[PDB]
Amino acid sequence: NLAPLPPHVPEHLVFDFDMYNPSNLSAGVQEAWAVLQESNVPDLVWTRCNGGHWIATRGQLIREAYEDYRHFSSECPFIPREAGEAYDFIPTSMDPPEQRQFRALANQVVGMPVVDKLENRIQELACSLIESLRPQGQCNFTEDYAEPFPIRIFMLLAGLPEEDIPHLKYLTDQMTAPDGSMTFAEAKEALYDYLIPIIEQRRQKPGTDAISIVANGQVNGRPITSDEAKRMCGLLLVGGLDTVVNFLSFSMEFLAKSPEHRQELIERPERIPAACEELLRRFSLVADGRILTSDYEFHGVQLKKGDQILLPQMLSGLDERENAAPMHVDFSRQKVSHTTFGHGSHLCLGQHLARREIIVTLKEWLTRIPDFSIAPGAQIQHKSGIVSGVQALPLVWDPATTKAV
Numbered sequence: 001n002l003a004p005l006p007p008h009v010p011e012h013l014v015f016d017f018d019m020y021n022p023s024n025l026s027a028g029v030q031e032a033w034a035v036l037q038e039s040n041v042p043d044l045v046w047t048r049c050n051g052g053h054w055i056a057t058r059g060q061l062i063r064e065a066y067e068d069y070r071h072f073s074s075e076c077p078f079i080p081r082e083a084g085e086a087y088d089f090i091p092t093s094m095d096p097p098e099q100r101q102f103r104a105l106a107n108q109v110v111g112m113p114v115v116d117k118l119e120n121r122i123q124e125l126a127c128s129l130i131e132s133l134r135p136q137g138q139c140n141f142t143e144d145y146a147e148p149f150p151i152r153i154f155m156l157l158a159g160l161p162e163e164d165i166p167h168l169k170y171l172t173d174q175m176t177a178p179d180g181s182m183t184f185a186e187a188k189e190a191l192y193d194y195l196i197p198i199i200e201q202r203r204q205k206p207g208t209d210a211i212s213i214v215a216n217g218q219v220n221g222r223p224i225t226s227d228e229a230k231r232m233c234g235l236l237l238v239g240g241l242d243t244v245v246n247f248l249s250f251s252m253e254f255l256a257k258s259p260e261h262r263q264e265l266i267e268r269p270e271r272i273p274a275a276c277e278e279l280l281r282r283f284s285l286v287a288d289g290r291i292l293t294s295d296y297e298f299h300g301v302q303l304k305k306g307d308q309i310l311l312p313q314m315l316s317g318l319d320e321r322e323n324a325a326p327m328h329v330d331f332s333r334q335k336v337s338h339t340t341f342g343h344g345s346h347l348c349l350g351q352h353l354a355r356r357e358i359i360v361t362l363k364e365w366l367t368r369i370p371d372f373s374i375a376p377g378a379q380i381q382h383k384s385g386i387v388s389g390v391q392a393l394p395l396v397w398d399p400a401t402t403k404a405v
């Protein structure tokens with residue numbers, strides 16, 4: 001349902017890609033997006049869907065634009081424009097140099113030292129969950145594992161009660177892959193209002209949790225305000241609750257459908273870190289963007305001030321110019337090139353936590369439930385958006401084949 005072509009946009013660059021409902025979604029969501037890398041598709045195209053915006057389709061351009069924050073601003077990073085304008089999460093809605101003071105604070109609460117700290121706890125959350133599912137011979141992996149494992153890890157990190165999980169998870173869904181019940185803005189404001197009273201509790205009586213640290217943080221030589229803390233904690237929550245959740249489901253759908261790749265990791269456990277990186281390339285799932293700060297000529301194309309440009313992080317590693325046979329999963333692939341965690345100054349802060357959650361899941365699942373497949377008669381369906389995902393993943397196994405360590 002398409003917006004009229006802006007005067008400055010050449011009509012031969014039009015390709016009406018809908019990022020929330022792409023044409024070939026039934027073939028798998030990465031497959032659907034990959035059509036933007038067809039021979040007949042330009043390196044930089046314009047879609048009239050979702051209010052109209054640019055799309056960079058190749059890794060070269062995507063990296064280039066994410067590096068140039070002077071022209072491509074993160075102030076309005078979501079499509080549609082109404083979402084992007086409402087978007088005020090910290091650090092992401094800020095450009096350097098102002099972004100950097102807030103990024104250091106956020107890195108304090110989810111960075112590698114924190115993750116090393118939480119290793120034994122992450123390991124047990126996984127094992128407890130899997131040992132509980134193991135004798136049942138079946139699960140809906142998205143809501144039985146993919147959702148609770150990362151989210152309990154985050155609630156742990158944030159010092160938040162697991163009672164609040166249903167409320168919170170719903171809100172984050174609306175911001176990346178909404179049904180239509182709430183706009184981005186009201187979903188975001190709901191999350192903010194959840195966090196305000198907790199932030200104000202913890203400014204006064206400090207702490208070791210992510211919220212306490214953020215609420216007591218110092219930025220620009222001053223205390224962080226309750227409103228800044230809120231904009232940052234909201235982002236950490238969205239980060240903590242929606243991407244890994246979705247990625248685990250892509251990777252497990254794949255392993256469920258490929259006994260060979262399972263047995264490779266079963267037989268060669270040391271390969272699991274390398275396998276994790278190649279899964280991150282193949283089932284890359286993020287796509288947001290930037291907004292033009294001024295009129296600018298970019299690879300032969302005149303971009304105007306206020307134009308929005310989708311720079312799909314997902315597409316870089318599926319680009320056949322960056323990786324040979326991109327849709328093929330090769331755990332021994334020699335140079336794994338992707339931008340799954342982003343590129344430029346907003347490079348994912350949670351990527352060390354994310355890899356840990358992924359690698360612990362692969363290790364602990366295949367150690368206990370080595371053999372499993374898609375439930376008979378089931379057809380897996382994907383969804384698309386800022387963060388694409390899997391709607392459901394019913395898995396089955398013979399409990400007799402399962403192990404206890």
Ligand code: HEM
Nearest residue numbers: 091092236239240243247286313341342346348349350354
């Ligand atoms: C598979 C897992 C994940 C993927 C693929 C992913 C992807 C990304 C991407 C592509 C960006 C850059 C977005 C942009 O440039 O606009 C980003 C940023 C960010 N991510 Fe992640 N993410 C993951 C997990 C996490 C986790 C677990 C957290 C934990 C809180 C997290 C927190 C953040 C934060 C705070 C930023 C903003 C950094 C900044 O703006 O400076 N992410 N993520």
Ligand SMILES: CC1(C)[C@H]2CC(=O)[C@]1(C)C[C@H]2O
Nearest residue numbers: 092176238239243286288386
């Ligand atoms: C695009 C993101 C994945 C990234 C910045 C966002 O707003 C996210 C949706 C959460 C954060 O990690």
Ligand SMILES: [K+]
Nearest residue numbers: 075084085087
């Ligand atoms: K904004």
